[PDB]
Amino acid sequence: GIISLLDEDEPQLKEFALHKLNAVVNDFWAEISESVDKIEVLYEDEGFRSRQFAALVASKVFYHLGAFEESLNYALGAGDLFNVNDNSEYVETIIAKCIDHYTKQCVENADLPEGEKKPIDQRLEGIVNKMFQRCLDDHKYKQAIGIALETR
């Protein structure tokens, strides 16, 4: 029971709840699954300026429950500190599914002549052009042309 401590309708107790989240979220994996609804309340609220972190622990708990397309939605909603991570489970499986959506999206939009596409959501392209520079400046261009395969 860590979400009933949120009747203070500012983000300034949502932040103490998140300071509880990033402390004991793996123990309280049972707890947030009911709190999916109020995490949605946090994402919908533009006045909640920590909505980046709302989508962060959203994709965390959906990575726990096995949601993956909504892990993609709130993975894009997570922000700029999303792609930059070097972690070996969470961030690389979800950017695996994300740039898998990028290549299947570029296939479907390569199957879609002259526009009318689904646009670039504002947190794609990050590790595309950032791990792409790892592949480039690691001086083997086979990934650098493998993306050119994958985008058509």
Partner 1 sequence: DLYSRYKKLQQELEFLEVQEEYIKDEQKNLKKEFLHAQEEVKRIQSIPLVIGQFL
Partner 2 sequence: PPPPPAPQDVEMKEEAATGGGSTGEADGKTAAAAAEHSQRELDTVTLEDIKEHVKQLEKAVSGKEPRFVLRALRMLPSTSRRLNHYVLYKAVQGFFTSNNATRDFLLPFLEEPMDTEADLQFRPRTGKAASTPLLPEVEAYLQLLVVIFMMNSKRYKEAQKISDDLMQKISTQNRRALDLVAAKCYYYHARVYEFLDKLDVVRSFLHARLRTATLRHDADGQATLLNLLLRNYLHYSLYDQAEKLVSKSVFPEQANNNEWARYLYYTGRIKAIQLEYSEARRTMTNALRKAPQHTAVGFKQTVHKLLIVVELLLGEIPDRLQFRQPSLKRSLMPYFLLTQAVRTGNLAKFNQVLDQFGEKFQADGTYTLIIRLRHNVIKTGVRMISLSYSRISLADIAQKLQLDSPEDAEFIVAKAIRDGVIEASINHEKGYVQSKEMIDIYSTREPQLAFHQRISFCLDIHNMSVKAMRFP
Question: Taking the complex as a whole, how short is the minimal distance between the CB of residue 142 and partner 1, in angstroms?
Answer: 4
151 contact, one of partner 2, partner 1, none, CB 5-8 Å limit per kind = none
26 contact, one of partner 2, partner 1, none, CB 5-8 Å limit per kind = partner 2
d(C-alpha 47, C-alpha 84), whole Å? 25
Question: Taking the complex as a whole, how short is the minimal distance between the CB of residue 100 and partner 1, in angstroms?
Answer: 14
**Is 134 buried (19+), middle (13-18) or exposed (0-12) by CB count in 10 A?**
exposed
Question: Taking the complex as a whole, how short is the minimal distance between the CB of residue 143 and partner 1, in angstroms?
Answer: 6
Cβ closest to partner 1, residue 85 vs residue 146: 146
d(C-alpha 60, C-alpha 51), whole Å? 14
Q: Report the residue from 41, 65, 124, 131 that binds partner 2 according to the rule CB under 8 A.
A: 65
- The answer to the question of residue 143 lying near partner 1 (CB under 8 A) is yes
140 contact, one of partner 2, partner 1, none, CB 5-8 Å limit per kind = partner 1
DSSP class of residue 47? S
- With beta carbons less than 8 A apart as the criterion, state whether 75 and 52 touch: no
Q: Report the residue from 4, 86, 88, 149 that binds partner 2 according to the rule CB under 8 A.
A: 88
Q: Torsion angle, CA of 113/115/121/123, rounded to 10 degrees?
A: 70
